[PDB]
Amino acid sequence: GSSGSSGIKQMLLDWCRAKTRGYEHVDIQNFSSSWSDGMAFCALVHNFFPEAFDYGQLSPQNRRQNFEVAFSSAETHADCPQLLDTEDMVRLREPDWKCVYTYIQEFYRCLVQKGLVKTKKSSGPSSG
């Protein structure tokens, strides 16, 4: 049927939910429009560091606040690099998945070191 045995693009989507489980007015299904509202990003973060910023405090109407806050809240103690362009994200009817995906992969790098995500070591062949 389809090619590619494994796919990071999958574990990424399935993961986000695991951390965004329960969150109201939220549902991660794809990096197409699921992150066009703004709340999405925030939620995912709030989960890790809720005290860092208030979730229910933000609003869905705010296209920037949701984004910015979501970004800053991280840089706080996660000092994560801001790749996405909130400014461009706003005007853009939908957040280019090609980009959103990058962030998720990036942040997942800071968390691991932060001590939030406990990844495993799968001893296998050399892929590099």
Structural domains present in the chain: 6-113 (1.10.418.10)
Helix (H) or strand (E) holding 115, with range, is none
DSSP one-letter code for 113:
H
**What is residue 42's DSSP assignment?**
H
Residues 36-47: b if buried by 16+ CB within 10 A, e if exposed:
bbbbbbbbbbbb
Residue whose C-alpha is closest to residue 113's, from 88, 77, 82: 77
Q: How was this structure determined?
A: NMR
Neighbours of 100 (CB within 10 A): 23
Specify the 3-state DSSP secondary structure of 107: helix
Q: Report the C-alpha gap between 61 and 64 in whole angstroms.
A: 9
